[PDB]
Design a protein around this nucleic acid. Structure first.
Ligand SMILES: OC[C@H]1O[C@H](O[C@H]2[C@H](O)[C@@H](O)[C@@H](O)O[C@@H]2CO)[C@H](O)[C@@H](O)[C@@H]1O
Ligand SMILES: OC[C@H]1O[C@H](O[C@H]2[C@H](O)[C@@H](O)[C@@H](O)O[C@@H]2CO)[C@H](O)[C@@H](O)[C@@H]1O
Lengths: 437, 437
DNA sequence: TTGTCACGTGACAAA
DNA sequence: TTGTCACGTGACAAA
C-alpha cells in the first residue's frame, strides 16, 4: 500500500485493542473530516521495514519501542517534535524508551510487562517459585488439568526465566549498550533454559505450545496458569475463569526479569500526513477519553499519560504488572535488538524440540545475536567479484574453443577444454581430473 | 509435534468452528477417555505436507478437498474405509470430491461456495451484475460508504469473476483433468481480471484489501457488500448489520462461477490412532449433534450428512449458497491444484498492484500452473552433476598448483593458474581473459 | 529428456 | 577487512 494525502492508515498488532483505536479514529474523522483506517496485519514489525524503505507502508505504526531504533537507523521514521506542554503529560521514562541518538522517534503509549496469570478456583494460592511447578503439575494432572501453559514460540515469553539467574541481552556499561557483549550463553542463561527444557522432557509442557494454544487452555480452564500481558485480560474476562495476576515465580531464589516494552506509535517518514498524524496521536489518542476507548477493548497496561495512569494504577492487575516491570528491565531500542530476538527464538525452539542441546543452541544464539549484518555495498562487492571471476574464465575458454583446434567432441563442457589445454602443455589428466606431468 | 498413542490432535483452519469442534472432542473424551485437542495453526495446508513426510503432524487435518490429492500422492494420508452403510449417510457427490486414484482419502464434511453478502439497510436491492457496481460505488461514496470489499489476497475470492466469461483451471476431458491444458490466460480470464483491476484504478476497491479488512468494513457497516462463505455469517449475526445472502453478480451476462470446496477430514498415515480417528469422525462428528455443535460456532455450509442437511437446507442462506454452487464447479483434487493456486494468487496480486499488466500476470500464471515439478531424483541428478563438475576442475588445479612451478604469487585464484597454463601452452591472456595464440 | 554455465550467497581463512 | 571456492537451482539449449 501507499500513503496518500487526506487519510490516515494505522498498523497495530492483532493482540491490541484495534477496535477501540478504530473508535478514536472515528471521532477524529467526525471532528476534522479525515478518514482513519486501523489494520492489524501479520508480522507487521517485519513488513514495515521492507515496504517503508521504498515509501510504502502505513501512516502510523504501533509496536513496542524495541523495534524503533532499527527503523530510525534505516531512516524510516519521522522525528517526533512535541511541544513542552505535551511532553510534560507523559512519564519521563516512557520518553526515554523512544529516544534514539538524542531524538524522539515515536510517541509512547503504554508500559507492558509479563505477569503470572492463575486460576483462583483451580489454584487458590499460586506458587512462588519455578521449582515447585513440576510437583504442582503432577497433582493437577491427577484431576485432568495442567499446571502451566504459555507461548514457547516467542522468546519474549521465555526470557524472564532465562534472565532470572543471570542471562542478559546486551551489557550496559558507561552509558551505553555494548553490541558485542551478549549474555545469552552464560551460566544464568543456560540454567534457565535447561529448566525449561527439563519441563518439556518431564512432560510438564509441550514444545509446540503457542499463543493460541495456551490462551485457549487457560481460558477454557484446562490449565492452572499462564504467562501473558495486559492485552490478554479481556478474553479471560469474557470467560468463566476467576483469575488473579501476580508476580512471576522465582528461579534459584532470584526474581524472573521480564523485558519491559513500551507500546509506541511512530510516524512513517514517507507519509504526507505527518501533521494530521501528530494531531491524531497528541489530541485524540493520548487523552483520557482516547486511551480509555482503546483500553476498554484490550487493556493497554500502565499508560504513559499521567492523567489516565492515575486511574488505571488503582487496578491491582496493573499494580502486579508494575511489580513485575520493576523486577525487569526496559528493552534496548538499538538496531541489533531484532537480531537478538531472532537468535534467542531459534535457540529456544531448537532446544525445546531436541534438535540441539541447550549448550549448542545458546552458543549459536550468542554468535548470531552479535553478528554484524553485512552492508549492501559489501554484498554488491561480493556479487560483482564473482561476476568478474566468471567473465574472465569465460573469455579464456571462448578463446581456447575458437583458436585451439583441439580434438573436442561436438558438445562438451569447459572441463574438457581445460584437459585438452593440459595435454598440449605436457600434462596427463585422468578421468577424475588427477593431473600430472 | 508428534502424535502420541491414546490421544487425538486435530488441525482445522482458523475461520472454521474449531471451538464447536472442541466440544465434540470433549464428548469423545467423556465417553472413551481419549483426549482430543483442536488446534488452528496458520498455513496448516502448507505445514502438513512438510511435517507429515517424516511422521510428524496431527492425527486429523481439516481442509477443502482440493489439497488432499497432493497429500495422497506423497503418501501422507491413511486410506478411508467406511462401511457401505456409513457411505450411504453422505451425499454421493461429496464422496467423489475425496476419491483419488479409486480410493477414498478423507471424510467429507460440508460443501462451501462463495455468495454475495449485502447490507439490506444500505442496499435493499442488491445489484445483479458486476458492471453496475462502479456506479453503485459512486452513489454510496457520497454517503461516506463503499459498494464492495472482499479479500483480494487469496485467489479463491476472485476466481468466480475470472471464470465467469470462460476462465478455467484444468480442462476436463475423457474422464480426467489435463494438467497441461490450463485456461488462466484465455479471453474470459483476461476480461474478468481486467474488470477487477479497473475497479482498483477507478478507486472502487483497494489492492491491499484482505480478509480481515473486508470483514471489519462490512460488519461495521462501512461497505454495502462483501463476498464470503458460510463461515463468516456468525460474526455478522453478532454485529448490528441486517444482511442478506444472494447470488453472485453476473459478468458479461454470465454467472460468476465459484470454485466449490468440500471441507474434508483426512487421517495422517503416521497416526497410531487411526481407529480412534475413524470412530471420532464417523460416530461423533458426522452426526446431527456433532455437526450441529460445529455449525453453531461457525456455519459449515451444506453438510455432507443427509439427515442434518435436511434441516440446514431449510435456511435461505444455504439455499443461496447452493444456488451459487450449482453455477460453479467442484474443485479438482489433483496434486497440481496447489501449483495452480499459487500461480493465480501471484497473478491477481501483481495485476491488482500494477507490478504487472493483466496480460503479463496471466501469461506467467499459465506457465507456472502447467509447469512440471521436477522430481527429487531430477534435483539430485542436477546437484550431483555440478558437484562432479567442480570436483574435476578442483583436481586439475590442485595438480597444476603442486607440479606446475608456474611462478605464482603466494595467494591467487584458479584463473591465475589457468593463465599460467595458457602461456605454457603458447597462448597470451589479457587481463580481461581475452585469449589468443 | 539430459546437459552447460550463470547466479549470489555461504563456509572458511589469511591478514 | 578482503578474498577463494563451494553450493544447489535457474536460464537456456540440443536433442
Ligand atoms: O518474542 C520476541 C518479541 O518480543 C516482543 O514482542 C512482544 C510485544 O512487545 C508485545 O506487545 C506482545 O505483542 O507480545 C510480543 C511477543 O509475541 C518484542 O517487542 C518484539 O520486538 C520481539 O520480536
Ligand atoms: O485462495 C486459494 C485457496 O482457495 C481455497 O481455500 C479456501 C478454503 O477452501 C475455504 O474453506 C476458506 O477457508 O477460504 C479459503 C481461501 O482463503 C482452496 O481450498 C485452497 O487450497 C487454496 O489455496
Amino acid at each position: 500500500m501507499k500513503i496518500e494525502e487526506g487519510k490516515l492508515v494505522i498498523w497495530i498488532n492483532g493482540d491490541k485493542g484495534y477496535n477501540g483505536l478504530a473508535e478514536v479514529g472515528k471521532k477524529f474523522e467526525k471532528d476534522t473530516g479525515i478518514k482513519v483506517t486501523v489494520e492489524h496485519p501479520d508480522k507487521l514489525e517485519e513488513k514495515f521495514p521492507q515496504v517503508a524503505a521504498t515509501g510504502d507502508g502505513p501512516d502510523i505504526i504501533f509496536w513496542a519501542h524495541d523495534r524503533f531504533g532499527g527503523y530510525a537507523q534505516s531512516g524510516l521514521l519521522a522525528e517526533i517534535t512535541p511541544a513542552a506542554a505535551f511532553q510534560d503529560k507523559l512519564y519521563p521514562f516512557t520518553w526515554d524508551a523512544v529516544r534514539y541518538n538524542g531524538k524522539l522517534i515515536a510517541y509512547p503509549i503504554a508500559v507492558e510487562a509479563l505477569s503470572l496469570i492463575y486460576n483462583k478456583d483451580l489454584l487458590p494460592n499460586p506458587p512462588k517459585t519455578w521449582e515447585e511447578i513440576p510437583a504442582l503439575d503432577k497433582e493437577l494432572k491427577a484431576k485432568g488439568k495442567s499446571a502451566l501453559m504459555f507461548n514457547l514460540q516467542e522468546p519474549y515469553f521465555t526470557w524472564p526465566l532465562i534472565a532470572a539467574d543471570g542471562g542478559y541481552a546486551f551489557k550496559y556499561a558507561a552509558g551505553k549498550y555494548d553490541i558485542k557483549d551478549v549474555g545469552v550463553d552464560n551460566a544464568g542463561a543456560k540454567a534457565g533454559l535447561t529448566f525449561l527444557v527439563d519441563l518439556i522432557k518431564n512432560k510438564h509442557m509441550n514444545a509446540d505450545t503457542d499463543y493460541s494454544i495456551a490462551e485457549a487452555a487457560f481460558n477454557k480452564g484446562e490449565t492452572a496458569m499462564t504467562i501473558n500481558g495486559p492485552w490478554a485480560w479481556s478474553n479471560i474476562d469474557t470467560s468463566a475463569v476467576n483469575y488473579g495476576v501476580t508476580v512471576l515465580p522465582t528461579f534459584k531464589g532470584q526474581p524472573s526479569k521480564p523485558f519491559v516494552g513500551v507500546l509506541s506509535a511512530g510516524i512513517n517518514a514517507a507519509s504526507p500526513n505527518k501533521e494530521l498524524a501528530k494531531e491524531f496521536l497528541e489530541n485524540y489518542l493520548l487523552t483520557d477519553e482516547g486511551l480509555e476507548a482503546v483500553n476498554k477493548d484490550k487493556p493497554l497496561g500502565a499508560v504513559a499519560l499521567k492523567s489516565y495512569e492515575e486511574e488505571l494504577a488503582k487496578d491491582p492487575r496493573i499494580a502486579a504488572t508494575m511489580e513485575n516491570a520493576q523486577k525487569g528491565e526496559i528493552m534496548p531500542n538499538i538496531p541489533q535488538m531484532s537480531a537478538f530476538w531472532y537468535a534467542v527464538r531459534t535457540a529456544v525452539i531448537n532446544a525445546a524440540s531436541g534438535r540441539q542441546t541447550v549448550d549448542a543452541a545458546l552458543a549459536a544464539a550468542q554468535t548470531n545475536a552479535a553478528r554484524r549484518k553485512p552492508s549492501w555495498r559489501e554484498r554488491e562487492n561480493n556479487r560483482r567479484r564473482e561476476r568478474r571471476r566468471r567473465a574472465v574464465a569465460a573469455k579464456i575458454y571462448t578463446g581456447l574453443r575458437a583458436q585451439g583446434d583441439y580434438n573436442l567432441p561436438k558438445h562438451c563442457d569447459n572441463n574438457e577444454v581445460l584437459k585438452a589445454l593440459c595435454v598440449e602443455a605436457g600434462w596427463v589428466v585422468e578421468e577424475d581430473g588427477t593431473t600430472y606431468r
